[PDB]
A paper describes a structure:
MamA is a magnetosome-associated protein (MAP) involved in the biomineralisation process by coating the magnetosome membrane. Each TPR consists of a helix-turn-helix fold, in addition to a putative N-terminal repeat. As such, MamA adopts an overall superhelical structure enabling the protein to be highly involved in protein-protein interactions via two main binding sites, one at its concave surface and the other at its convex surface.
Here, we have solved a new structure for MamA from the alternative species, Desulfovibrio magneticus strain RS-1, and compare between other, previously solved MamA structures and this distantly related species of MTB. By comparing these volumes to a standard calibration curve we determined that the three peaks correspond to sizes of a 13-meric oligomer, an octamer and a monomer. Crystallisation trials of octameric and monomeric ArsTM resulted in the appearance of a single crystal form that diffracted to a resolution of 2.88 Å. ArsTM monomers assemble to form a trimeric ring, each enclosing a ~15 Å diameter inner void; the crystal asymmetric unit includes six ArsTM monomers arranged as two trimeric rings. The employed forces that allow the stabilisation of each trimeric ring include salt bridges as well as hydrophobic interactions between the N-terminal of a single monomer and the C-terminal of a nearby monomer in a continuous manner, resulting in a ring with surface properties akin to a Möbius strip. As such, ArsTM presents a distinctly atypical binding surface since, as mentioned, the protein-protein interactions involving MamA typically bind via the concave or convex surfaces. Unexpectedly, but not altogether unsurprisingly, the triple mutated residues (E140A, K141A and E143A), along the ‘backbone’ of the monomers, were found to be at the centre of a crystal contact. The tight packing of ArsTM within the crystal could not occur with the original residues, which contained long and charged side chains and hence, could not be crystallised. The overall structure of the ArsTM monomer contains 10 anti-parallel α-helices, folded as five TPR helix-turn-helix motifs, namely TPR1 (H1 and H2), TPR2 (H3 and H4), TPR3 (H5 and H6), TPR4 (H7 and H8) and TPR5 (H9 and H10), similar to previously determined MamA structures. In ArsTM we could not detect such domain movement, as the conformations of all six monomers are similar. Whilst these salt bridge-forming residues are conserved in ArsTM (Arg47 and Asp76), the salt bridge itself is not since the distance between these two residues is too great.
Numbering used by the authors:
A (entry chain E), B (entry chain A): 38 to 214
C (entry chain D): 38 to 213
């Protein structure tokens, strides 16, 4: 069912993304899209490309095109959530991320993103609940203790912040190779 | 007779350009120019410097100074044409590039620049004619097959585009091995 | 007197600065400052951080906070001078730099900075006097001969400029 033109442009696209030049890959993803119109994958890959180039708003638009074709596209949502967050559109990220966590409830990174989102929207206790899940799902990861630390700082509870940070340090030390 | 100050500042200039710091070289090229006023070489090198810094509009200006002193300065034209094209001033780039091709008709890169200029000015068939010359003059070069491809895409002739791209791929493969 | 929270955030701060990520270190310097309020060192480190990030105007402000607590803080002034100069506020840099040179009169770099400052404020002869000090205090440094050269160029004395630059070249050659 996949045409020869699509196979070709998908191939060249992949090369460009592997040699790390998104801007070129885009031109060939457009072509793959042209020839398998209604296939979400090329659109999805555009989305990834546009996000790496920092053209965030247009990545959100492309991810929406992918979600129109597959409303439960797990990764499209994850990625869209991630960019909505990088752009500081927290209120719009929350429902998306909360959907991701519902599909992949053992995925620390997701709960971390969710926590950052809640924190941006000034729902601090919900950010802490999320980020704590991320810590519990992956306790080795410094990033998560660190944010829990700063989240406690903003709560004006400096006692707990320090507990989180003393652990940040214990971790940085034992990862000295 | 060149004169000792010129020899000196030329020397230092060269060092700076070789160690890859244009911004410093400029200061010395100015001086070489001060002392061999009417010699086009320093000006020419300024132009190259400015272009590498991305100060394009000022490079064009300096290349014009060089062409006022040597109206057939082959390289000054080539470089001016190249920057006119980077800045998207296509109409002005065409006569210049068309002059370079006339002086160096076996030079694929010139024809490629010319093709990109025509394509920017929405003269598509003329861009294909140029880019095809470039391909014919240097068939190993992926870049030229690739633009031919995309130029056919804009013509809405996807059959030929794919023929050019299948060759893009055959080339990318045999340059891994 | 230095307490456990400070020791901790100072520690983490240092790590961040060593692994070369200023933006993170800042967050922790803030915390060290919160807990040893009135200690100038965290503030001074903020200053350095901000200047590395290119947030120059806010570095000047923090260095000022450090100078309010220690008016002769030698390094605070040096760094503040250096950033005032990078930002092209020459008239304000001169008194600061002239203070640094008073405190560290064998420091070429300080005189070089001073000379650049004078030059920016169109006091060219004073710039040459400073830069010359820098060259005399550190004759191996190309940078200083170079600026002397260009300072003479602006004076329209091309004979001397060339003498400085022939030396710039002699030095670039013997250093490959």
């Amino acid at each position: 069912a996949m045409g020869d033109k699509a196979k070709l442009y998908r191939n060249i696209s992949q090369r460009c993304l592997r040699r790390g030049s998104p801007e070129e890959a885009l031109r060939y993803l457009k072509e793959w899209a042209r020839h398998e119109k209604n296939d979400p994958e090329p659109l999805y890959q555009m989305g990834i490309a546009l996000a790496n180039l920092g053209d965030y708003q247009r990545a959100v638009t492309v991810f929406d095109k992918v979600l129109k074709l597959r409303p439960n596209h797990f990764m499209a949502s994850y990625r869209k959530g991630a960019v909505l967050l990088k752009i500081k559109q927290y209120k719009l990220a929350l429902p998306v991320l909360e959907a991701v966590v519902a599909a992949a409830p053992a995925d620390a990174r997701a709960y971390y993103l969710l926590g950052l989102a809640y924190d941006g929207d000034e729902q601090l206790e919900k950010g802490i609940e999320a980020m704590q899940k991320a810590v519990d799902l992956d306790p080795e990861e410094i990033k998560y203790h660190q944010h829990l630390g700063f989240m406690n700082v903003r709560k004006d509870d400096h006692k707990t912040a320090a507990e989180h940070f003393t652990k940040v340090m214990e971790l940085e030390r034992s990862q000295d190779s």
